[PDB]
Amino acid sequence: NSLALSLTADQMVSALLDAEPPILYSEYDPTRPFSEASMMGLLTNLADRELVHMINWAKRVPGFVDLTLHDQVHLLECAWLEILMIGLVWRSMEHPGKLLFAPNLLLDRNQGKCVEGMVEIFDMLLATSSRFRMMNLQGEEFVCLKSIILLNSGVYTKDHIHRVLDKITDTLIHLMAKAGLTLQQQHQRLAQLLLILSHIRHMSNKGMEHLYSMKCKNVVPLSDLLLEMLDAHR
């Protein structure tokens, strides 16, 4: 029996907020990257450090440590780029037309043109951030969505995870009712939030192909960890 299913809605919100990874910085050099080598070098270094926090974040997601070690590996391998991207979209929310990869690293789509194939994913991330802003997405909602991605993206690659996934749904509805939304507004916003997860999956799939292409180019050195995260997607 899992401790995760005995938590209340508030306890679930508190546990997820306390597990949040910090916002990491990029290199403090103030040249704006317009090279593919300089831009992908800073993003890869950034993502490599973020992955170490993601792994320890996931262990604090309720119900995650009840899974086998293999199941934990599988879910993280499938979801890692989705989790990085929804985090990027979240903190870029208050910077319209900009992507805040780090507080000292904001990229516009004019820089995304410096890599073939990047500007297309750039615009999808931009539109996702604008969608979050127009919906007035809250932090308590964001961490529920990020946890759903971790648990759902690799389920059918199971009774326990679906029970935890239902628990997070109750938590999302709890936050909306707490915010004074009517019954009709609650289920509509629930649907609007979860349909964005389809687009987050789409962006990750396109991003994964972009990283595989960068690996074959062999100019940007990838860490062994990012290499194994990338190799997991066949």
Partner: peptide
């Protein structure tokens, strides 16, 4: 196969 993730998930 020995992934880095296996080690990092233990602690």
């Amino acid at each position: 196969k020995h992934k880095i993730l296996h080690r990092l998930l233990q602690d």
